[PDB]
Paper text:
Using cryo-EM, we identified six discrete assembly states (A, B, C, D, E and C*) of the human mtSSU through global and focused classification strategies and solved their structures to resolutions ranging from 2.4 to 3 Å. Furthermore, TFB1M initially sequesters h45, preventing h45 from interacting with and stabilizing the mature conformation of h44 until TFB1M methylates two residues in h45 and departs during the transition from state C to state D. As a result, this molecular clamp inhibits the premature folding of decoding centre rRNA elements and forms an assembly checkpoint in which h45 methylation is required for maturation of the decoding centre. Dissociation of NOA1 and TFB1M during assembly progressively generates the binding site for mS38, which in state D locks the relative orientation of h44, h27 and h45 in a near-mature conformation. Furthermore, in states C and D, the rRNA linkers connecting h44 to h45 and h28, which also have direct roles in mRNA decoding during translation, remain flexible due to the presence of the 3′ rRNA-binding assembly factor RBFA, as observed in bacteria. Although we did not observe a bound methyl donor in the enzyme, we did observe methylated target residues in states following dissociation of TFB1M (states D and E). In states A–D, the presence of both of these factors prevents compaction of the 3′ major rRNA domain, splaying rRNA elements and protein modules apart to allow for significant intermodule flexibility.
Mitochondrial ribosomes (mitoribosomes) synthesize proteins encoded within the mitochondrial genome that are assembled into oxidative phosphorylation complexes. Biogenesis of the mitoribosome requires trans-acting assembly factors that chaperone rRNA folding and guide mito r-protein incorporation. Here we used cryo-electron microscopy to determine nine structures of native yeast and human mitoribosomal small subunit assembly intermediates, illuminating the mechanistic basis for how GTPases are used to control early steps of decoding centre formation, how initial rRNA folding and processing events are mediated, and how mitoribosomal proteins have active roles during assembly. Furthermore, this series of intermediates from two species with divergent mitoribosomal architecture uncovers both conserved principles and species-specific adaptations that govern the maturation of mitoribosomal small subunits in eukaryotes.
Author numbering:
A (entry chain 0): 165 to 216
B (entry chain O): 48 to 237
C (entry chain U): 27 to 103
D (entry chain N): 4 to 112
E (entry chain M): 10 to 124
F (entry chain D): 190 to 229, 239 to 430
G (entry chain T): 2 to 165
H (entry chain 0): 6 to 55
RNA sequence: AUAGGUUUGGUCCUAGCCUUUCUAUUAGCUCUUAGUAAGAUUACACAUGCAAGCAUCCCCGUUCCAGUGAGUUCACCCUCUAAAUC
């Protein structure tokens, strides 16, 4: 579900624009893959300690 | 001690006031003493210090029967321009800063009480359209969770972890553990 | 604040930051809550980005903008 | 987006032709005096590429910005000669003129 | 001004006077001072209850959405404020702190009962 | 009551003028001292008289004794009275720029309640005349006699709205911001009305004063301008 | 007094009185006019009275004048596209020239009002900041809110000195 | 503008000296197991790794 | 259907009944004064200026719309019971996006119990004034609107000032606006001060209120005494159209009443003080004959 | 500037200087309370104590914040286009 205020704003905009649909606004999370925090990162992008 | 303290306006309709001032404002004959042709841009703070009057008291302080009260509309009118409706600045009449502040407060109070006439402009409406059909002021359709009494998201509620995960955490944090917390109280304890 | 060239204080050389202890159940519940919250926030952020890009595209190559451009050119001619 | 040169279209008088394929042009703008509130002429010198070397001292020319500067000071090219010095053609009637007098009458055509 | 790296973030800039705080919701470079240069003011927040017993929060929702869509980050207090407004889901730490307070008050009530 | 300063004769009242030999009383007239000078010894006094209702004048009196000079100047002033036309009996009919010898006087008509923001001698003379609202600036040599002469000349040479209406044969209509777009006809010609309108001068060729334009544009910065002062 | 004939021309009010705001296409305006000849009279007045106003409303447009180069006066506008607009102004009054140029190459009042409304949005009345940019500095200036401690001391319970 | 050539020389020299004096993995990631500190820098490792 | 207040017909009759007095409409205001300007004009130019002033007055006298009392806002967006007890004071969230009508602007309240609800009308107006200040409007209700100060205002015959303050302070559909306007109208009717509102934009609303409450007797009598007979006949016609099922309407239809006969029929049918209406009408007719 | 004092035996003109107004620093004398704001003269030299950590090791940060005004048209607009956030 959308957050309460954002859902209310979406519904209000639809009703203002003439749309009378009763379908709930919904956030797609199929494209959001929450990768575990311990997954290996890209070592190629990592830095190196400087010589001192 | 003034006998007009309870009803200050009476003093302005008494014959003593007419003899002293006539029809001119109470500040008409006052003159500030200063060096130069250009006076200081502010008046003295007060003519009365520790219950002692200064040599040249201002028009208000020189008459103890003159009371600055929001009901004494006739007195307050003398310190407001009749053509522009603006309160004179203190150097204009020579009133001290304290009496000027008191006069300004009394004039504002009288205007707020409808006792002193002042210009009220005619203004335009705040909004161009007065419709009240928008959802911001109308009723939004309730969400299914609100109808069912469930939290907006399932993760707002406490779910007891499985025993295996708790044991895994206990192994991960050996020697650095607190007492395990059970489900919290359903309502806020009173 | 200190720069990288400023020496460390001598009263802190033996300082050891002991990690805080962990409540397992609250830890697990908090981890799940963070995962869900970040998922929702990322979805909202992608939608906002899409709206911003759509508004930019409608401002540049929008149908109303193109109609206005053609009308202005015709008026000039 | 079409050029990195600030001044895109400018009109000036040619004041120098001693450089090869380059005309030194004087451009006047109107600048308000902040105190007197009167408009005075402010001058600026521009170098314009003249490939054919058809510019003469004193003629009024139009300069168009180059897509990029071709030299340190050459940022413009000669789009056209608005008024050839002593060889002005009246734009309104299209007839040659010498000052305010017609060399060839409009009625003749 | 050019900062090494950095990003835009929507945060609270503290103004007001001693013992009277007030916050301006501003989108600013993360490296800039707290009350220094900002890109745009996106709202305000008065943390002191007024004569009506209300904490007033003003949010420029259109511009907030625009700057979030432009890649701006959010400070944690702003995430909590937006969760309170209902613009975002409630932040996990609000829920966790509510549960902690519930347990603490339950312990206090149990102490009272034991006494 | 003191005059302009504690030790100054200027601004001090001399009382009503004496009854004249003609048999006329002047109890409604007030006399004010404008200048006292030692003539090398005798005393020369410049005084002004006025009834506060448009009738005013000024005179010089020379005598060995100061009081005799006062009396002579007052009695001669009452017999050389000007009449000053007043717009609504509080201000002048229009702005007046004049130069008498080396003394320049720029006077500006002002709305009601504006007060007398003018040279102190001009304030005294206006009070004698009955003018209550006006602005005045004096430039060049500040010579009291020249100032008085120029002031009286300019005030006596002002054209009223009725005179302008008769001259142009047209309605003189007043526009007030406080009254909105309502046209207030303040004067109409006694004779017939001309049917052709005034030329709509696209840009009039008027002589503007740099001080007024500078004040209007906000470039005037004087610390001495618009200072708070006692009622005048 | 102010120097020169028609000193009103050198006041900001007159300079702002102009009604010609060129479209963004215009870059250069050349004014060829004759110092003598009755048929060019308006053009001379156009140079005398209205060029300052046009330049004031169009600071970035290069305005250039030419004298006694052609038998008749004319105006030429150069546009960014390279198109040239020739306006014959012989026998025309200065007001007529202003109206013509406003009609053919001047922004209409609709565009100007749209621009003004766009400028309005930049100064949001709800924003708090210095008076140079915002109506109010602090929320304490709003009635009903907790006032500034500078003017009204806060209660002892709300002050850290007496909370510590 | 008066050129700043010493800055050019310094940056080039520092780049060369950093490319030629690279610390190796055996030096960077060595550890003193008794104190659990890096000999290269002297910084101690976090407690949770000990 | 029954005519609305904003209908072209009703607006035309109310506009004609209000009148247009340029001196009262553009009375000299007490404010910062500037030196007046002067123009030399012919008769034709003066007439042009007069008609332009008439147009300006017509724009100024535009009647405000008459609106019904707004329904209270009682809507709940969410109930997050987890937040109950975590806060002591409510949070008010106002969406200050500039290009939104104030009646479409989302304003919400998170209460201490955790309920996210929509702000009430009073809270909405207060927040709008806080963040979009309007000249003449105060965030806190001025004390002039207390009924004691309102009696004082009425005693000073400053009803127009009261209505201007009400328009500046309250929304047209708010309860306070309706109550103050109705109280002012009641005072005017009780003390016969209708002329105070003539040539003002509130006269139409006052007439609408009187007609809808069936208390036009005093206004009709005042109009007859002021020889505004056309206004009285138009008032009777407006009463009939607003109440076409009333006894006066059928009486006028049956007796074919036009002009003065309409007033007579109304006085005989649906007048609370029809006797005095008849007396005043008879006196007006007698004076007309004598003149 | 609403101006005023001052040249001469005297008048007028020209012209300087000063007075009246509002700020800031310092000095003399004097000084009760509460709140708020502001706070080395010196790019002269500095005792002493703190001002940068975090983190399952890698990295990241210490290039920020804070300070000063020595030097001084590197600050603003357009074009192009690195690094950084999404
Ligand atoms: S300036 Fe707002 S609290 Fe002080
Ligand atoms: K790290
Ligand atoms: K410096
Ligand atoms: Mg003295
Ligand atoms: Mg001098
Ligand atoms: Mg001497
Ligand atoms: Mg001291
Ligand atoms: Mg990149
Ligand atoms: Zn006093």
């Amino acid at each position: 579900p959308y957050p309460p205020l954002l859902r209310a704003m979406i519904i209000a905009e639809r009703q203002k624009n003439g749309d009378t649909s009763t379908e709930e606004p919904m956030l797609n999370v199929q494209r959001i893959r929450m990768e575990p925090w311990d997954y290996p990162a890209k070592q190629e992008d990592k830095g190196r300690a400087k010589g001192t | 001690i003034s006998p007009y303290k309870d009803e200050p306006w009476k003093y302005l309709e008494s014959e003593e006031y007419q003899e002293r001032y006539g029809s001119r404002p109470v500040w008409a004959d006052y003159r500030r003493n200063h060096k130069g042709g250009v006076p200081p841009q502010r008046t003295r703070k007060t003519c009365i210090r520790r219950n002692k009057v200064v040599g040249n008291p201002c028009p208000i302080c020189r008459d103890h029967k003159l009371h600055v009260d929001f009901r004494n509309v006739k007195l307050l009118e003398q310190f407001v321009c009749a053509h522009t409706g603006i309160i004179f600045y203190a150097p204009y009449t020579g009133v001290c800063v304290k009496q000027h502040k008191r006069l300004t407060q009394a004039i504002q109070k009288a205007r707020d009480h409808g006792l002193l006439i002042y210009h009220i402009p005619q203004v335009e409406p705040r909004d161009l359209d007065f419709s009240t059909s928008h959802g911001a002021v109308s009723a939004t359709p309730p969400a299914p969770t609100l109808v069912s009494g469930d939290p907006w998201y399932p993760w707002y509620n406490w779910k007891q972890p499985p025993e295996r995960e708790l044991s895994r955490l206990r192994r991960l944090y050996q020697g650095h553990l607190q007492e395990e917390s059970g489900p919290p109280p359903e309502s806020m304890p009173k | 604040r200190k720069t990288r060239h400023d020496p460390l204080a001598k009263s802190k050389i033996e300082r050891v930051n002991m990690p805080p202890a962990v409540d397992p159940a609250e830890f697990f519940v908090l981890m799940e809550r963070y995962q869900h919250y970040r998922q929702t926030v990322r979805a909202l952020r992608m939608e906002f980005v899409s709206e911003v890009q759509r508004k930019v595209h409608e401002a540049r190559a929008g149908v109303l903008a193109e109609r206005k451009a053609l009308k202005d050119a015709a008026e000039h001619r | 987006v079409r050029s990195s040169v600030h001044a895109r279209w400018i009109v000036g008088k040619v004041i120098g032709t001693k450089m090869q394929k380059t005309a030194k042009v004087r451009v006047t703008r109107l600048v308000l005096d902040p105190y007197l509130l009167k408009y005075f002429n402010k001058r600026k010198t521009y170098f314009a590429h003249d490939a054919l070397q058809q510019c003469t001292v004193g003629d009024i020319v139009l300069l168009r910005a180059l897509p990029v500067p071709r030299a340190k000071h050459v940022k413009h090219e000669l789009a056209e000669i608005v008024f050839k010095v002593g060889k002005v053609i009246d734009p309104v009637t299209g007839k040659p003129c010498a000052g305010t007098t017609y060399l060839e009458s409009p009625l003749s055509s | 001004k050019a900062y090494r790296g950095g990003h835009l973030t929507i945060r609270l800039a503290l103004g007001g006077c001693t013992n009277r705080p007030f916050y301006r919701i501003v989108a600013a470079h993360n490296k800039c001072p707290r009350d220094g240069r900002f890109v745009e003011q996106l709202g305000s927040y008065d943390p002191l209850p007024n004569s009506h017993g209300e904490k007033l929060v003003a949010l420029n929702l259109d511009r907030i959405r625009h700057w979030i869509g432009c890649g701006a980050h959010l400070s944690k207090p702003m995430e909590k404020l937006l969760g309170l407004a209902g613009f975002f889901p409630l932040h996990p730490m609000m829920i966790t702190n509510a549960e902690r307070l519930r347990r603490k008050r339950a312990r206090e009530v149990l102490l009272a009962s034991q006494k | 009551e003191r005059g302009w300063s504690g030790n100054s004769w200027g601004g001090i009242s001399l009382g009503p003028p004496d009854p004249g030999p003609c048999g006329e009383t002047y109890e409604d007239f007030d006399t004010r001292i404008l200048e006292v000078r030692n003539v090398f010894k005798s005393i020369r006094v410049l005084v002004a008289v006025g009834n506060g209702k448009g009738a005013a004048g000024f005179s010089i009196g020379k005598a060995t004794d100061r009081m005799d000079a006062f009396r002579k100047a007052k009695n001669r002033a009452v017999h050389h009275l000007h009449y000053i036309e007043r717009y609504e009996d509080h201000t002048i009919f229009h702005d007046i720029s004049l130069r008498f010898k080396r003394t320049h006087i720029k006077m500006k008509k002002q709305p009601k309640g504006y007060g007398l923001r003018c040279h102190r001698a001009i304030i005294t003379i206006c009070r004698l005349i009955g003018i209550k609202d006006m602005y005045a600036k004096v430039s060049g040599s500040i010579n009291m006699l020249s100032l008085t002469q120029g002031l009286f000349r300019g005030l006596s040479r002002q054209e009223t709205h009725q005179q302008l209406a008769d001259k142009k044969g047209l309605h003189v209509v007043e526009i007030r911001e406080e009254c909105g777009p309502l046209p207030i006809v303040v004067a109409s010609p006694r004779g017939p009305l001309r049917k052709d309108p005034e030329p709509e001068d696209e840009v009039p060729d008027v002589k503007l004063d740099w001080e007024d334009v500078k004040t209007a544009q906000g470039m005037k910065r004087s610390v001495w301008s618009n200072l708070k002062r006692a009622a005048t | 007094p102010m120097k020169g004939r028609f000193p009103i021309r050198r006041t900001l009010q007159y300079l702002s009185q102009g009604n010609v705001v060129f479209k963004d296409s215009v870059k250069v305006m050349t004014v060829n006019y004759n110092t003598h000849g009755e048929l060019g009279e308006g053009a001379r007045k156009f140079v005398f009275f209205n060029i300052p106003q046009i330049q004031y409303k169009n600071p970035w447009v290069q305005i250039m004048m030419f004298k006694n180069m052609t038998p008749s006066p004319f105006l030429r506008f150069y546009l960014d596209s390279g198109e040239q607009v020739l306006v014959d102004v012989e026998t025309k009054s200065n007001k007529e020239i202003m109206e013509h140029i406003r009609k053919i190459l001047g922004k209409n009042e609709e565009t100007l009002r749209e621009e003004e409304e766009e400028k309005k949005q930049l100064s949001h009345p709800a924003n708090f900041g210095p008076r140079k940019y915002c109506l109010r500095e602090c929320i304490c200036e709003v009635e009903g809110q907790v006032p500034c401690p500078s003017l009204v001391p806060l209660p002892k319970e709300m002050r850290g000195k007496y909370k510590a | 503008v008066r050129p700043r050539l010493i800055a050019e020389l310094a940056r080039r020299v520092r780049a060369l000296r950093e490319q030629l004096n690279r610390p190796r993995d055996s030096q960077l990631y060595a550890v003193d197991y008794e104190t659990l500190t890096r000999p290269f820098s002297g910084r101690r490792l976090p407690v949770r790794a000990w | 259907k029954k005519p609305t207040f904003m209908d072209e017909e009703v607006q035309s009759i109310l506009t004609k009944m209000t009148g247009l007095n340029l001196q009262k409409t553009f009375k000299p205001a007490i404010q910062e004064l500037k030196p007046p300007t002067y123009k030399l004009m012919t008769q034709a130019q003066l007439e042009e200026a007069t008609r332009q002033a008439v147009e300006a007055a017509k724009v100024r006298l535009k009647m405000p719309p008459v609106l019904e009392e707004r329904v209270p806002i009682n809507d709940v967006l969410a109930e997050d019971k987890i937040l109950e007890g975590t806060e002591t004071t409510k949070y008010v969230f106002t969406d200050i996006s500039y290009s939104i009508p104030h009646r479409e602007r989302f304003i919400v309240v998170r209460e201490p119990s955790g309920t996210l609800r929509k702000a009430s009308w009073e809270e909405r107006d207060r927040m709008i004034q806080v963040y979009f200040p309007k000249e003449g409007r105060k965030i806190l209700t001025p004390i002039i609107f207390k009924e004691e100060n309102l009696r004082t205002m009425y005693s000073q015959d400053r009803h127009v000032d009261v209505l201007n303050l009400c328009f500046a302070q309250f929304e047209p559909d708010s309860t306070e606006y309706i109550k103050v306007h109705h109280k002012t109208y009641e005072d005017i009717d009780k003390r016969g001060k209708y002329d105070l509102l003539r040539s003002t934009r509130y006269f139409g609303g006052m007439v609408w209120y009187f007609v809808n409450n069936k208390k036009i007797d005093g206004l009709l009598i005042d109009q007859i005494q002021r020889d505004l007979i056309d206004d009285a006949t138009n008032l009777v016609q407006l009463y009939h159209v607003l109440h076409p099922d009333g006894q006066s309407a059928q009486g006028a239809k049956d007796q074919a009443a036009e002009g003065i006969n309409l007033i007579k029929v109304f006085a005989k049918t649906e007048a609370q003080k029809g006797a005095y209406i008849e007396l005043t009408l008879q006196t007006y007719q007698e004076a007309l004959s004598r003149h």
